[PDB]
Amino acid sequence: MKEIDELTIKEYGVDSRILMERAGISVVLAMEEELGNLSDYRFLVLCGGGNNGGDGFVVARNLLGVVKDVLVVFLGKKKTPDCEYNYGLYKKFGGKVVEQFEPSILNEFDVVVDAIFGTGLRGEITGEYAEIINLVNKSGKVVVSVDVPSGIDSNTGKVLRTAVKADLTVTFGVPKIGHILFPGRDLTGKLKVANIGHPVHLINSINRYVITREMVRSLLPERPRDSHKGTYGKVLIIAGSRLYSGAPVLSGMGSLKVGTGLVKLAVPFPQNLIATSRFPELISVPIDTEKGFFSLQNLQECLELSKDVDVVAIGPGLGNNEHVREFVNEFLKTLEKPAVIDADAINVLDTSVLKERKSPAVLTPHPGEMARLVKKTVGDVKYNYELAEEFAKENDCVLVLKSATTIVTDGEKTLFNITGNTGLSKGGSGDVLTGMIAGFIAQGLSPLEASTVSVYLHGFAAELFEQDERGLTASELLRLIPEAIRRLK
Amino acid sequence: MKEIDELTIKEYGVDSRILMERAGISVVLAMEEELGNLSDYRFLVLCGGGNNGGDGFVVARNLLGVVKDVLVVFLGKKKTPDCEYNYGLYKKFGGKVVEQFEPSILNEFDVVVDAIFGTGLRGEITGEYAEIINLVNKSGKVVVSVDVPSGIDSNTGKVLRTAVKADLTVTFGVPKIGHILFPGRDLTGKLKVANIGHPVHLINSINRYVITREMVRSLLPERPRDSHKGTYGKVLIIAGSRLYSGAPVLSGMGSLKVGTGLVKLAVPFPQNLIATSRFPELISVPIDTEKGFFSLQNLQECLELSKDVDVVAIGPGLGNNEHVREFVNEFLKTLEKPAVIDADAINVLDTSVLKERKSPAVLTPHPGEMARLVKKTVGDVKYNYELAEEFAKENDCVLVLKSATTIVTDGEKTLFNITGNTGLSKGGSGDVLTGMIAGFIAQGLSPLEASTVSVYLHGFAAELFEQDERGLTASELLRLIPEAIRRLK
Amino acid sequence: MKEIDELTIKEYGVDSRILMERAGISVVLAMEEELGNLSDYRFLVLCGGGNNGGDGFVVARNLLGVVKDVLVVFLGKKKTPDCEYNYGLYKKFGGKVVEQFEPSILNEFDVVVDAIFGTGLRGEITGEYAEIINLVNKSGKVVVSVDVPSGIDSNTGKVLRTAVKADLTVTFGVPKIGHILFPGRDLTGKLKVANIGHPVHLINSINRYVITREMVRSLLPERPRDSHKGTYGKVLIIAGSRLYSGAPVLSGMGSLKVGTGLVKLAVPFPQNLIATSRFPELISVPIDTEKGFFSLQNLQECLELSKDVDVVAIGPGLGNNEHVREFVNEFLKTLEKPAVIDADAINVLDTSVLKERKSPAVLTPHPGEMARLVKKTVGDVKYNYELAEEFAKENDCVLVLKSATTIVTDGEKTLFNITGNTGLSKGGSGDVLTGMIAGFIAQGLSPLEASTVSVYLHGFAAELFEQDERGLTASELLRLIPEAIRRLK
Amino acid sequence: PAWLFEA
Amino acid sequence: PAWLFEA
Amino acid sequence: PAWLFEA
Amino acid sequence: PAWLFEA
Ligand SMILES: Nc1ncnc2c1ncn2[C@@H]1O[C@H](COP(=O)(O)OP(=O)(O)OP(=O)(O)O)[C@@H](O)[C@H]1O
Ligand SMILES: Nc1ncnc2c1ncn2[C@@H]1O[C@H](COP(=O)(O)OP(=O)(O)OP(=O)(O)O)[C@@H](O)[C@H]1O
Ligand SMILES: Nc1ncnc2c1ncn2[C@@H]1O[C@H](COP(=O)(O)OP(=O)(O)OP(=O)(O)O)[C@@H](O)[C@H]1O
Ligand SMILES: [K+]
Ligand SMILES: [K+]
Ligand SMILES: [K+]
Ligand SMILES: [Mg+2]
Ligand SMILES: [Mg+2]
Ligand SMILES: [Mg+2]
């Protein structure tokens, strides 16, 4: 995007001042859309010495004589050329700038326009800057952030010591990663993405995307009327144990609710009977185990079962002991079908096995599972999209790193999911998603497409729950998936 | 406004390119507001070699990659610097320009953006330009005009041989006189006035205004609860004759419907009885005349009647013969009260009398009456605001020159009224307005304020008629005035 | 239309049987539209020996096996070839025909399809035919007439001794005059006009038309926004007397309510004051008369008044005595303006005067006035469109012969008006229409166009009266004209 | 729709 | 909201 | 209409 | 009404 601005100026020949004017007017129009008529509000515009601040001067200037009051507090020690030109215009148009910030200044204003730092933020915020930001955050005023709330690192979404909490963030060209990942996503408040005049070809050149409704709608497979169950694929799910009897059910129904033709579970007896007592449209094959867990003794029967399906999901509720590890790894090494690898199958996975497989894979870890898979801490892997990209590329797989924002990548393309709510922070949610992914692969979508469509619909189904989200359970999520699908169209 | 652009560039220091960018984006946003989503439309943008065309290139460029198709036909022989910069940007962004216009080109487009000439139009349009404009006008496509429809003189509203007929005109800063006066007002279609970044102080520096709802609302006099009829003034109307018995009635009710406390008519007997048979709240004084018309024999009685009122309206239906002329002129020469002078009182008026009067006057001619008053042709006075200004200034009066757009001026300030419809093109309409003006003067408004408020409310009342406007009559207009007043608040 | 059938068969080459099939199926579809699903009804189809009966056999045949019962009573003594072919088909498809009619047969049927006589009816109906028709009319059953109810002369609308009273008449190609004029219009019930496959060029070749909404909408003059009262014309109405003071008022308002710019009445003093006491937007000029009626002493003043208008209406309430006759005739002989001639001006008119006039005229007699004008009986002129055509052609005028169906002709084109109700059978209705016609001529319509538009809108205004039509008066009709105009668009 | 029937 | 457009 | 703003 | 058309 820094490249995108540079290229639009230096190669397309758009004057930097024109981009800055377009930026500032976007902010004004966005504020109108969100606040109604602006003429009765008093505005405090906080400007840094960079181009974020220059954008702020354009805002301040365009409000002069139209709103009740405008004041700029200029907080920098020097001005870039664009900021300087705009500062000059603001003053020439009669605008008041002060350079001293006063704790009680927030008193006489209704809206704070935060133009202190955008993408040029480098390093922790301290000193006056920190104080001012902490004052704004205690004030209860309406806060509108220019580009990115000041103090959010726009590449990571991390808070650099402190950051503005915005009601509205107006960003230019494309969303920044720091609007998408938390905590930045939380501080952004409502996000509007403004077109400021970059050529559309450059804007579409970005390789990381937010999964949208329109993208998911164009990926949903077709339902030709002259069809039969095999048209819509066959999934095998290897799952469950005597400790964990519920997981297979949630995964199997997850495949069926997204439109899969046939779903077969392989589950240790008698825990297999649990699935059809709840959902008799599932096939739940009893697997004879020594102690209630899959082991090498079950390898041959599972590979046999695999021959007559399109995709295999493995992992939810398998448990994690040595015999499960031996079985999961030998199985995956031999299985020549796409695999969806989750939960305890990830906990025992030997990643060499992924490298040697000819057929594809999707892995669906939460950060604790990712952390153990790559031998790092939760904090190093959480929201770490570059690590996820390297992992997917090195191991030839699609990685779905689950969290309130989910990252989906094959190492070349990375997509970010923002649907969902905290009702999904509850046992059983993951199991459902695993079924959904396998189901969509069986219907003909690529592992990456299948993952994209499933994370979005899974979170969107959660949002459609009628009562308080904290009461949502996996069973109710399943009931909601077909409404999510209908609403997507 | 040319001064306004120059001053914003040369003294405030806004780069001309920034004004041009703001102009072009206004047009795009206005088109969205009016057409909805633009992404399915095909646009033909016609650009002249001036800054109007430069605005057009900004439009074309901002549509690239967002709509179905964009084509510019460049029709000039050379380009101003701003147009050239924008033309260069449009091409650099991948835009197609052709310089040959082809009669069938309109075929493959849905919207024509007319950026051929704006305020720089000089002289009749001929040649290719004329052909292209005539083609656009026969095409049935959606036409959006940049600044002013090409071929309208923006200072007068006249068509310079031919002009574009627009569905939507997007103008910058302030309405131009050529959007306000006909025929230009008709060719403008729907007008949006866009703020492109001129300092608000310069925009408010324009001396000619369009009468708005908000202006009229702020001028309506107060109705203090502890009031009595004298609080709201007293009007005398000298009007009527044996030929013209209806006019006094319409004028008198016009004063009462705008809230005047007392209204007295002086009308030749027995034609005076006509007024109270219809509206018994009117006082209609019988004047004894020799032959059914006012003459010098009635001077003394009229001046007596004048002593106990605040304002006098004179003229509607008096007739026009020598004795009326002698009476009207001697009366006005002696009357030391504000006068509202209409109809036959204008037809007989000696304008020297206006110069010698100490008290104020409003004159309310239609163009035929103005033409005879200044000894010019109808065509020379019609919509001739500069002539109206000179007349008002020379004779110390307010001039209300009635037409579909009405001009109201005291020689310093000129206001244009755009309310009304063709139902007012019917006998009796003028008589009503005369009463309204006198009424508002009696309530405490200046002659100019009274005229401003009355022309607006008179036309607005017409618009509120429930059935087809051609069936509107003066009597029904009167019934509508109090609803117009309520809707203004 | 007989020509039209012949030409479609013999020159276009459509087989007569195809036209007959298309006719019969039209009747079935029309019956569905009007009765809903037909499957539960029992049908008695009465067929004559001609092609009307042949149409009836096509109907009967197309109902077989779809409705509860079908029976044909064939009433002729022989069959035309088309009727014979269809009779043969009806029988081959299993249909029952009886040739004896039985008074109690109506008992077991719900719908009677009347295909006894259409346009081939010649002479009075007697004998069995008459009995059967009288039986059908006493039966209370649903009656559907094929082409024209049997016993109506399709060229005149007269009843030839007796005729079927239909709930629904399905006619082919174009309405017949006998559906349009009474009593036939009354016996027709609801009329549907079916396209049976005649070339559209032949159907449009008919010279007599029913005035439709769409025709009137395309004739309404334009209301250009930049207009003034003179744009919309000036009417003089010469009307009234000491006996008849009301008529001028109704005529003058009639011109104003259809959108005329200026309306002037000339009325004997003091009866002129009546007009402005009711409607002060009228100019009502006092005319000094010896005894309360226009006479030659008023000729010069009326011709003077005529110079400044576009059209003159004369007649309503003038009275009818020798001096009125002398005045009306000398006036019309000298008047070089279009004239609208009504009421007492018709009663005194010397028709030589019409022949010598260079300017046009519309005459608006009711049949009593027409009868006296041409020295015939009311019964010979009533609904006599050919006589009206000859009169208009001989005297170079437009004739508007008023009745529940009004005939409007210039001798070449004849139009029939079917709007209106019995509330217009009341004094003052004619006076209104006279004003309307003059008004539309003043606005730029031809005498014929003006008459077409006015008769339709006049009757349509009557229909919009909210309460029982018998309570409608002329004053309330006037109030309704602008709603009629709005509804036309 | 008035291909078949005019009112 | 009339920052951009006056009617 | 999303010429200016994407949600 | 289904004289002409069956769905
Ligand atoms: N706050 C949140 N907002 C949006 N999505 C969330 C949130 N919390 C959890 N989720 C989603 O719910 C799913 C949780 O799967 P995960 O495997 O972490 O836990 P789990 O459901 O306990 O596992 P299991 O289903 O095996 O019990 C993931 O898609 C994750 O993205
Ligand atoms: N097309 C129109 N649109 C808006 N206003 C109009 C239109 N035509 C006429 N008017 C208004 O109606 C009033 C007409 O007054 P004017 O004195 O011209 O004619 P008049 O009503 O015949 O005069 P009088 O009332 O003496 O008969 C004016 O305010 C004029 O502005
Ligand atoms: N039953 C009816 N249906 C439709 N229109 C009718 C009916 N009866 C009368 N009319 C119409 O009303 C108008 C009557 O005009 P006419 O001159 O016959 O009588 P009038 O109103 O008494 O005359 P005046 O207005 O001079 O008193 C005509 O247009 C006529 O067509
Ligand atoms: K910021
Ligand atoms: K233009
Ligand atoms: K018949
Ligand atoms: Mg899980
Ligand atoms: Mg006037
Ligand atoms: Mg009559």
Task: Say which of C29, C33, C193 has its CB closest to residue D6.
Answer: C193
Which residue in chain A is spatially nearest to E5 when comparing CA positions?
A: A29
In order of A322, B114, B151, B178, B186, the CA distances from B136 in angstroms are 80, 9, 13, 20, 16
- Per residue in B331-344, is it b (16+ CB within 10 Å) or e — as a string? bbeebebbbbbbbb
Helix/strand/coil for B398: strand
Residues 6+ apart with CB under 8 A from A473: A426, A428
Q: How far apart are alpha carbons C204 and C4 in whole angstroms?
A: 11
Under 8 Å between Cβ of A406 and A430: no
Cis peptide before C183 (omega within 30 of 0): yes
> Roughly what angle, to the nearest 10 degrees, separates helices C447-463 and C474-488?
110
Q: How far is residue B73's CA from residue B133's CA, in Å, rounded to a whole number?
A: 12
B430 touches ligand 2 (CB under 6 Å):
yes
- A 10 A CB-CB count for A476 gives 15
The answer to whether chain E touches chain B by having 3 or more C-beta pairs less than 8 angstroms apart is yes
Q: Which tokens in the block code for residue A55?
A: 């954008």
* Rounded Cα–Cα distance for residues C415 and A303 (Å): 90
Backbone angles phi, psi at A401, to 5 degrees: -95, 105
Expt. technique: X-ray
C192 touches chain D (CB under 8 A): yes
| Cβ-based contacts under 8 A for chains C and D | 18
Which H or E run includes C488? helix C474-488
Residue with tokens 């000039």: B76
Min Cα separation D1/chain C (Å): 13
Contact B25, B192 (CB under 8 A): no
Q: Which of C222, C225, C228, C263 to mutate to test the pocket of ligand 2 (most atoms within 8 A of CB)?
A: C228
Mutate to test the pocket of ligand 1, among A347, A372, A405, A429 (most ligand atoms within 8 A of CB): A429
φ/ψ of B233, rounded to 5, equals: 80, 170
Instruction: Say if residues G1 and C36 touch (Cβ distance below 8 Å).
Output: yes
Instruction: Round to whole Å and give the CA distance between B243 and B215.
Output: 39
- As a whole number of angstroms, the distance between CA B416 and CA B124 comes to 26
3-state secondary structure of C414: strand
* Residue B459 assigned ligand-binding role: no
- Tell me whether residues E7 and B30 touch, CB distance under 8 A: no
Task: Give the Å distance between the CA of B231 and the centre of ligand 4.
Answer: 58
CB C347 near ligand 3, within 6 Å? no
Q: Would you call C412 an interface residue with chain G, using a CB distance cutoff of 8 Å?
A: no
CA distances from A105 to A52, A54, A438, C297 (A): 22, 21, 57, 92
Q: Report the distance separating Cα B348 and Cα B368, nearest Å.
A: 13
User: CA angle at residue C457 from C454 to C459, to 5 degrees?
Assistant: 105
Nearest C-alpha neighbor of C338 from the set C352, C358, C356: C358
The domains located in chain C, with CATH, are: 1-206 (3.40.50.10260), 207-489 (3.40.1190.20)
Neighboring chain B residues of A21 at a CB cutoff of 8 Å: 18, 21-22, 197
B319 φψ region: left (φ > 0), alpha (ψ -120 to 50), beta (else):
left
**Ligand 6 centre and the CA of C140: distance in Å?**
18
Q: Where are the alpha helices (DSSP H) in A321-446?
A: 322-334, 343-347, 351-356, 367-374, 378-381, 385-395, 429-442
CA distances to C240, C294, C318, C425 from C245, in Å: 5, 13, 9, 20
Q: What is the DSSP letter of A18?
A: H
DSSP-derived secondary structure for C331-378: HHHH--S-EEE-HHHHHT--HHHHHH-SS-EEE---HHHHHHHHT--H
Chain F positions with Cβ closer than 8 Å to B: 1-4
Check: CB of residue B147 under 8 Å from CB of residue B118: yes
* Contact call for G and A: 3+ CB–CB distances under 8 Å: no
Closest CA to A339 of A237, A221, A445, A256: A237
Distance between Cα B17 and ligand 4 center (Å): 26
- Computed on alpha carbons and rounded to an integer, the radius of gyration of chain D in Å comes to 5
Residue nearest to atom 24 of ligand 1 (CA): A428
CA C204, CA C36: separation in Å to the nearest integer?
A: 32
Cα-based distances in Å from A274 to A67, A265, A313, A472: 66, 11, 19, 22
Query: Is there an atom of ligand 1 within 6 Å of A343 CB?
Result: yes
β strands within B305-459, DSSP E = 311-314, 339-341, 361-363, 398-401, 406-409, 414-417
Which chain D residues are within 8 Å of C195, Cβ to Cβ? 3-6
**Residue bearing the CA closest to ligand 2, atom 14:** B430
CA of A454 to the centre of ligand 7 (A): 15
Tokens of C345: 């001006």
Q: Does B29 touch chain E (CB under 8 A)?
A: yes
A134, A111 contact by CB (below 8 A): no
Q: How far apart are CA B229 and CA B172, in angstroms?
A: 47
Whole-number Å distance between alpha carbons of B200 and C82? 86
Q: What is the CA radius of gyration of chain F?
A: 5
CB contact under 8 A, C281 and B470: no
- Distance from the alpha carbon of residue C65 to the mean position of ligand 6, in angstroms: 24
Mutation for E interface: B193, B204, B210, B211, most E CBs within 10 A: B193
Q: How far apart are CA C415 and CA C408, in angstroms?
A: 5
With the C-alpha atoms ordered C188, C190, C194, C200, is the resulting torsion angle positive or negative? Answer: positive
Smallest Cα–Cα separation from A177: which of A119, A115, A114, A117? A119
Asked if G4's CB is within 8 angstroms of C36's CB, the reply is no
User: Does B194 contact chain F (CB < 8 Å)?
Assistant: no
Distance, CA of C129 to CA of C334 (rounded, Å): 59
* Residue B406 CB–ligand 2 contact under 6 Å: yes
What is the four-CA torsion angle of B180, B186, B189, B194, rounded to 10 degrees? Answer: -20
The neighbourhood of ligand 9, an ion, using CB within 5 A, equals C 343, 430
Nearest CA in chain F to A25: F4
- The reply to whether residue C193 touches residue D4, judged by beta carbons under 8 angstroms, is no
- Residue nearest atom 11 in ligand 3 by C-alpha distance: C424
Q: Which residue has the tokens 């065309």?
A: B53
Q: What DSSP string runs through C238-275?
A: E---SS--SHHHHHHHHHHHTT-SEEEEEEETTTTHHH
Distance from the CA of B458 to the center of ligand 2, in angstroms?
10
Which residues, including other chains, have CB under 8 Å from residue A255's CB and lie 6 or more apart? A235, A237, A263, A313, A435, A436, A438, A439, A442
Residue C262 Cα: closest atom of ligand 2: 22
Measured between beta carbons, which residues in chain B are less than 8 angstroms from residue C229?
Answer: 425-427, 429
Q: CB of C210 within 8 Å of any CB in chain D? A: no
Report B:58-117 residues touching F (Cβ under 8 A): 62, 66
> What is the separation of C-alpha C206 from the centre of its chain, rounded to a whole number of angstroms?
16
The secondary structure of residue C152, as a DSSP letter, is: B
- Min distance C354 CA to chain D CA atoms (Å): 39
Beta-strand runs (E) in B92-207:
97-98, 111-115, 142-146, 168-172, 190-194
Residue B352 tokens read as 């020297």
Neighbors of chain F with 3 or more C-beta pairs under 8 Å: A, B
Resolution (A): 2.1
Q: Which of B195, B204, B215 to mutate to test the interface with E (most CBs of E within 10 A)?
A: B195
Q: For chains D and F, tell me whether 3 or more CB atom pairs sit within 8 A of each other.
A: no
Closest chain E CA to residue B194:
E5
Closest CA to C340 of C264, C448, C257: C448
Residues of C forming the annotated binding site for K(+)? 52, 114, 150
Chain F residues whose C-beta is within 8 A of a chain A C-beta are 3-7
Question: H or E element: which one contains A203?
Answer: helix A200-203
Chain C closest CA to G3's CA: distance in Å? 7
What SS3 class is residue B285? strand
Angstrom CA distances, C335 to B458, C312, C347, C435, stand at 38, 9, 19, 18
**Are the beta carbons of A195 and F7 separated by less than 8 Å?**
no
Contact between B437 and B364 under an 8 Å Cβ cutoff? The reply is yes
Q: Is B317 part of any known ligand binding site?
A: yes
How long a stretch of residues is chain B?
A: 489
> Which of B399, B429, B465, B470 best tests ligand 2's pocket when mutated (most atoms within 8 Å of CB)?
B429
Instruction: For chain B, list the contacting chains (3+ Cβ pairs, <8 Å).
Output: A, C, E, F
Residue C268: closest CA among C250, C245, C297: C245
Instruction: Cis check for the bond before C248: say yes or no (omega within 30 of 0).
Output: no
What is the CA(C368)–ligand 9 centre distance, in A? 10
Q: Are A40 and A202 in contact (CB under 8 A)?
A: no
Tokens of A219: 């990926």
Helix then strand then coil, % of chain E, to nearest 5: 0, 30, 70
For residue C193, give the DSSP letter.
Answer: E
**Helix spans in C375-427 (H):** 378-381, 385-395
Distance CA C195, CA A165 (A): 73
For residue A68, CA distances in Å to A225, B199, B202, C36 come to 62, 16, 19, 67
Residues with Cβ within 8 Å of C425's Cβ and at least 6 positions away in sequence, in order, are none
Sole residue written with tokens 């032959």: B291
Q: Whose CA is nearest to atom 20 of ligand 3?
A: C427
Count CB neighbours of A127 within 10 A: 8
Residues of B42-63 as b/e, b for ≥16 C-beta within 10 angstroms? ebbbbbbbbbbbbbbbbbbbbb
- Quote the tokens at residue B368: 């035929």
* Burial label, C450 (beta-carbon count in 10 A; 0-12, 13-18, 19+): buried
Is the alpha carbon torsion for B98, B101, B104, B108 positive or negative?
positive
